Design an enzyme around this catalytic site. Structure first.
Site, PDB file in Angstrom:
ATOM      1  N   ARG A 149       0.858  -1.175   0.000  1.00 29.75           N
ATOM      2  CA  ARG A 149       0.000   0.000   0.000  1.00 29.75           C
ATOM      3  C   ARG A 149       0.894   1.224   0.000  1.00 29.75           C
ATOM      4  O   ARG A 149       1.709   1.388   0.893  1.00 29.75           O
ATOM      5  CB  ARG A 149      -0.937  -0.007   1.211  1.00 29.75           C
ATOM      6  CG  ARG A 149      -2.002   1.085   1.194  1.00 29.75           C
ATOM      7  CD  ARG A 149      -3.037   0.857   2.323  1.00 29.75           C
ATOM      8  NE  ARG A 149      -4.266   1.658   2.150  1.00 29.75           N
ATOM      9  CZ  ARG A 149      -4.665   2.666   2.930  1.00 29.75           C
ATOM     10  NH1 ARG A 149      -3.961   3.052   3.992  1.00 29.75           N
ATOM     11  NH2 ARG A 149      -5.801   3.300   2.647  1.00 29.75           N
TER      12      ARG A 149
ATOM     13  N   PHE B  78       1.289  10.621   1.691  1.00 30.78           N
ATOM     14  CA  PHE B  78       0.867  10.068   2.977  1.00 30.78           C
ATOM     15  C   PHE B  78       1.900   9.068   3.515  1.00 30.78           C
ATOM     16  O   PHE B  78       2.619   9.381   4.469  1.00 30.78           O
ATOM     17  CB  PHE B  78      -0.520   9.422   2.827  1.00 30.78           C
ATOM     18  CG  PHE B  78      -1.109   8.889   4.104  1.00 30.78           C
ATOM     19  CD1 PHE B  78      -0.640   9.288   5.338  1.00 30.78           C
ATOM     20  CD2 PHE B  78      -2.139   7.969   4.055  1.00 30.78           C
ATOM     21  CE1 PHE B  78      -1.201   8.793   6.498  1.00 30.78           C
ATOM     22  CE2 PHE B  78      -2.699   7.474   5.202  1.00 30.78           C
ATOM     23  CZ  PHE B  78      -2.229   7.884   6.427  1.00 30.78           C
TER      24      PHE B  78
ATOM     25  N   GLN C 140       3.400   1.555   3.139  1.00 27.72           N
ATOM     26  CA  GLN C 140       3.168   0.492   4.126  1.00 27.72           C
ATOM     27  C   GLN C 140       3.597  -0.876   3.612  1.00 27.72           C
ATOM     28  O   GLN C 140       3.247  -1.292   2.502  1.00 27.72           O
ATOM     29  CB  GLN C 140       1.700   0.437   4.550  1.00 27.72           C
ATOM     30  CG  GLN C 140       1.396  -0.640   5.596  1.00 27.72           C
ATOM     31  CD  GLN C 140       0.061  -0.422   6.305  1.00 27.72           C
ATOM     32  OE1 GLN C 140      -0.454   0.689   6.345  1.00 27.72           O
ATOM     33  NE2 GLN C 140      -0.498  -1.487   6.870  1.00 27.72           N
TER      34      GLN C 140
ATOM     35  N   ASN D 249      -1.271  -1.045  12.866  1.00 27.50           N
ATOM     36  CA  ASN D 249      -1.985  -1.902  13.805  1.00 27.50           C
ATOM     37  C   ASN D 249      -3.453  -2.014  13.436  1.00 27.50           C
ATOM     38  O   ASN D 249      -3.889  -1.446  12.429  1.00 27.50           O
ATOM     39  CB  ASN D 249      -1.780  -1.430  15.261  1.00 27.50           C
ATOM     40  CG  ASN D 249      -2.329  -0.047  15.524  1.00 27.50           C
ATOM     41  OD1 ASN D 249      -3.469   0.258  15.172  1.00 27.50           O
ATOM     42  ND2 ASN D 249      -1.524   0.798  16.173  1.00 27.50           N
TER      43      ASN D 249
ATOM     44  N   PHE E 234       4.798   1.462   8.567  1.00 27.70           N
ATOM     45  CA  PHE E 234       4.757   2.410   7.490  1.00 27.70           C
ATOM     46  C   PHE E 234       5.815   3.473   7.613  1.00 27.70           C
ATOM     47  O   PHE E 234       6.261   3.859   8.704  1.00 27.70           O
ATOM     48  CB  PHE E 234       3.363   3.010   7.346  1.00 27.70           C
ATOM     49  CG  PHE E 234       2.841   3.692   8.586  1.00 27.70           C
ATOM     50  CD1 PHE E 234       2.216   2.977   9.568  1.00 27.70           C
ATOM     51  CD2 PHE E 234       2.957   5.054   8.731  1.00 27.70           C
ATOM     52  CE1 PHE E 234       1.717   3.622  10.699  1.00 27.70           C
ATOM     53  CE2 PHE E 234       2.463   5.686   9.834  1.00 27.70           C
ATOM     54  CZ  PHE E 234       1.855   4.978  10.826  1.00 27.70           C
TER      55      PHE E 234
ATOM     56  N   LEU F  10      -1.994  10.531  13.900  1.00 24.32           N
ATOM     57  CA  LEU F  10      -1.618   9.189  14.334  1.00 24.32           C
ATOM     58  C   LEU F  10      -0.928   9.176  15.682  1.00 24.32           C
ATOM     59  O   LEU F  10      -0.772   8.102  16.286  1.00 24.32           O
ATOM     60  CB  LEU F  10      -0.735   8.514  13.291  1.00 24.32           C
ATOM     61  CG  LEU F  10      -1.366   8.338  11.900  1.00 24.32           C
ATOM     62  CD1 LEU F  10      -0.356   7.710  10.962  1.00 24.32           C
ATOM     63  CD2 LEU F  10      -2.617   7.469  11.981  1.00 24.32           C
TER      64      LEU F  10
ATOM     65  N   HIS G  84      -0.275   5.074  17.037  1.00 20.81           N
ATOM     66  CA  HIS G  84       0.732   4.235  16.395  1.00 20.81           C
ATOM     67  C   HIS G  84       2.059   4.507  17.081  1.00 20.81           C
ATOM     68  O   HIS G  84       2.377   5.648  17.407  1.00 20.81           O
ATOM     69  CB  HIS G  84       0.834   4.544  14.902  1.00 20.81           C
ATOM     70  CG  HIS G  84      -0.407   4.214  14.147  1.00 20.81           C
ATOM     71  ND1 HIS G  84      -0.595   3.002  13.513  1.00 20.81           N
ATOM     72  CD2 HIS G  84      -1.553   4.914  13.958  1.00 20.81           C
ATOM     73  CE1 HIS G  84      -1.790   2.983  12.953  1.00 20.81           C
ATOM     74  NE2 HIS G  84      -2.396   4.128  13.215  1.00 20.81           N
TER      75      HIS G  84
END
Length: 163
Positions: free
Chosen positions: A54, A59, A62, A101, A112, A121, A125
């Site tokens: 991904r 952004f 991942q 997660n 990521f 986040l 995270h």
């Protein structure tokens, strides 16, 4: 004293370049050790040969699902999942390395690399590292992502280990 690990990245099997990370073992030792050991393969499983499934430009990138290759697998060196160690570090900008997660205390192997500041986040995270060398290579990877995260070419960790 903080460990450095590298990924050699390939695009449809063609070498792209090397990314190296500093792991913040002085702040998140348990989380850093998981990533380190998965990057050397010393426990008999890990990141070598796995893909970045991904990638959303602007952004993050991942990866780390080395069992199902699509975001629904992975495991840690401690078991299927482990706890959120602490949230001392924040998502301050591009280059931050952070655990993916599925809820509280569900860290596995997926991570990521942020390519933007992702402050929303923070506290959800666990941030455990940062790109040290090769941010240019992360930028080049990003160009093979898309808005929905599907990659146009297969982006793999051809080799990895500890420097």
């Amino acid at each position: 004293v903080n460990p450095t690990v590298f990924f050699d990245i390939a695009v449809d099997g063609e070498p792209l370049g090397r990314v190296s990370f500093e792991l913040f073992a002085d702040k998140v030792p348990k989380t850093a050790e998981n990533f380190r050991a998965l990057s050397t393969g010393e426990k008999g499983f890990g990141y070598k040969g796995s893909c970045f499934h991904r990638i959303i430009p602007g952004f993050m990138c991942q990866g780390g699902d080395f069992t199902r290759h699509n975001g629904t697998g992975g495991k840690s060196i401690y078991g299927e999942k482990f706890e959120d160690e602490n949230f001392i570090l924040k998502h301050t900008g591009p280059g931050i390395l952070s655990m993916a997660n599925a809820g509280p205390n569900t860290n596995g192997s997926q991570f990521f690399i942020c390519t933007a500041k992702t402050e929303w986040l923070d506290g959800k995270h666990v941030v455990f590292g940062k790109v040290k060398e090769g941010m240019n290579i992360v930028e080049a990877m990003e160009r093979f992502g898309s808005r929905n995260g599907k990659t146009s070419k297969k982006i793999t960790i051809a080799d990895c280990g500890q420097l």
